[PDB]
């Protein structure tokens, strides 16, 4: 049960840690497209998708793991019109790390913290 | 242990995901929607939709060497809580049919789901 | 080891699910809504609702021989983000009171929750 803390993901606002490392398994919090330095949210969905993804990556790498060890994601979205765009980014993100795609759920919710267009949580394994 | 689960008995991974992953001790499925594995059709009735997602979950869990009775956790994202009595009747019947202990569950009403399905079901199965 | 968890300190199961599953290394809870185990009722105020879901989670985790400080991941499903600051405050004091480090967390606003409660909270806890 080790806590994960990285400056390459946005710092914890409220009463949660960025990640927890259980030994075999790493769980991230839901990541939103907040810039870890500036605290800013990009306006385009394609930039939001990339930034949530990077924020997930940061926590997983801080645990000593890679993109390729992510086995499950959930993508919470606010607008299905954004779906093909989010998918393209999500695909390029995995391809660039030469990593097979995780398992995945994807649901459109009513609203997300800070009115972002998406939120991504992950589960990675050590081997 | 990481092994990708791939089956013709569940609908083909359309976008950037795999249907299931087998970690040895645990199996995770992608969220299963009511898409017919052979025809790509979405049944119109919520009873048939409920039944079809559960069957798709089954197909992936079985392709891993497991069964429905190994399912320990499900999340059931739905678009109408008024459908809930019917979903729940189908869902009870499914575990019963398979002589399976009921898993833990969360059920929430979301805004909308891929391909305008009424439910999406993700599952976690353990080996022993 | 697939042990069903059963406690009277959380509302009894109302359908095809169990309150919790103990796998040995981890414990998964069903999604907990703010129904009082003794009255079957829902308090109107969201601080009360948040506290109660959290107590209900704790009742199951504790039935497995674990404690609040062993909870590693929560998903908080809410129907109104305007409730969020209030829910956080209650959620934080809950963990502080138990001297527990905060779990990882996802928080989304859904459209509707069973019995029209304001939030629903599921958990995962680990033994070691």
Author numbering:
A (entry chain C): 2 to 128
B (entry chain A), C (entry chain B): 1 to 128
List sentences from the manuscript.
The sixth gene of the tdc operon encodes a protein, TdcF, that is a member of the YjgF/YER057c/UK114 family. The location of this gene within the tdc operon is strongly suggestive of a role in the degradation of 2-ketobutyrate. Each 14 kDa subunit comprises a single domain that contains a predominantly anti-parallel, six-stranded β-sheet against which are packed two short α-helices. The most significant structural features are the three symmetry-related solvent-accessible clefts, located at the interfaces between pair of subunits, close to the "equator" of the trimer.
